[PDB]
Amino acid sequence: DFEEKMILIRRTARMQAGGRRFRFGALVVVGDRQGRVGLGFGKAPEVPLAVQKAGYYARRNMVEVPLQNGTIPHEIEVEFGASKIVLKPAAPGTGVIAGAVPRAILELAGVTDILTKELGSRNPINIAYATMEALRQLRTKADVERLRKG
RNA sequence: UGGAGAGUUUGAUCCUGGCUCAGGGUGAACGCUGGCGGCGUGCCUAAGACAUGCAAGUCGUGCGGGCCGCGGGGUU
Ligand SMILES: [Mg+2]
Ligand SMILES: [Mg+2]
Ligand SMILES: [Mg+2]
Ligand SMILES: [Mg+2]
């Protein structure tokens, strides 16, 4: 068990003679607040069920966010298709400035002091997906020179 | 020591893309309302037209006299 906050939920739909069937979507984040988080997307015939599946995959796929002072190691940019995200580390006592998507994800990941910018396609879903791969690719002075051994 | 976005093309999706909004600002004006003070600020329009008053003068230690009001006899 971790935190588990719910990003957004939508009602989609398809066609079929007679009318339109349906489906709901659940994009969800999860994190103790120690440097561990997981994003999960859940589709299901009903609101609650979907929100459930959310957390399930959420916990399934999670990442080691190497914090530091409560901020972040280095500044990075990542593009996920059409949606691009900028993560830039702030000094203690700043705030977590971001949209609902990147902020939510960033809170449970721990961070308290981070500068963020949401460029490109601002597709909620895709921003999330983007935010993760960002963290995923975070390095510390350690694992840095850990590769420049030889 | 510094960086948040959202609504809106579709049965739904993703993308592109414009329109729209929340902010801050002003020698402001307009509506409704209106108690006190301090500090600022107040014809952005017709460089249109203007009554009245004032905004530029001063030195008798540069010089000669006019009027007014002071004191003082050279030829008897
Ligand atoms: Mg691209
Ligand atoms: Mg069309
Ligand atoms: Mg419609
Ligand atoms: Mg003028």
Swiss-Prot record:
One of its GO terms (molecular function) is structural constituent of ribosome. PANTHER family: MITOCHONDRIAL RIBOSOMAL PROTEIN S5. This is Small ribosomal subunit protein uS5. Keywords: Ribonucleoprotein, Ribosomal protein, RNA-binding, rRNA-binding. SUPFAM superfamilies: dsRNA-binding domain-like (SSF54768), Ribosomal protein S5 domain 2-like (SSF54211). The keyword Transport does not apply. One of its GO terms (biological process) is translation. It holds the Pfam family Ribosomal_S5. Is positioned such that it could physically interact with spectinomycin. One of its GO terms (cellular component) is small ribosomal subunit. Residues 2-65 form the S5 DRBM domain. The N-terminal domain interacts with the head of the 30S subunit; the C-terminal domain interacts with the body and contacts protein S4. The interaction surface between S4 and S5 is involved in control of translational fidelity. Disulfide bonds: none annotated. Belongs to the universal ribosomal protein uS5 family. It comes from the Bacteria. PROSITE patterns: RIBOSOMAL_S5, S5_DSRBD. With S4 and S12 plays an important role in translational accuracy. The gene is rpsE. Part of the 30S ribosomal subunit. Contacts proteins S4 and S8.
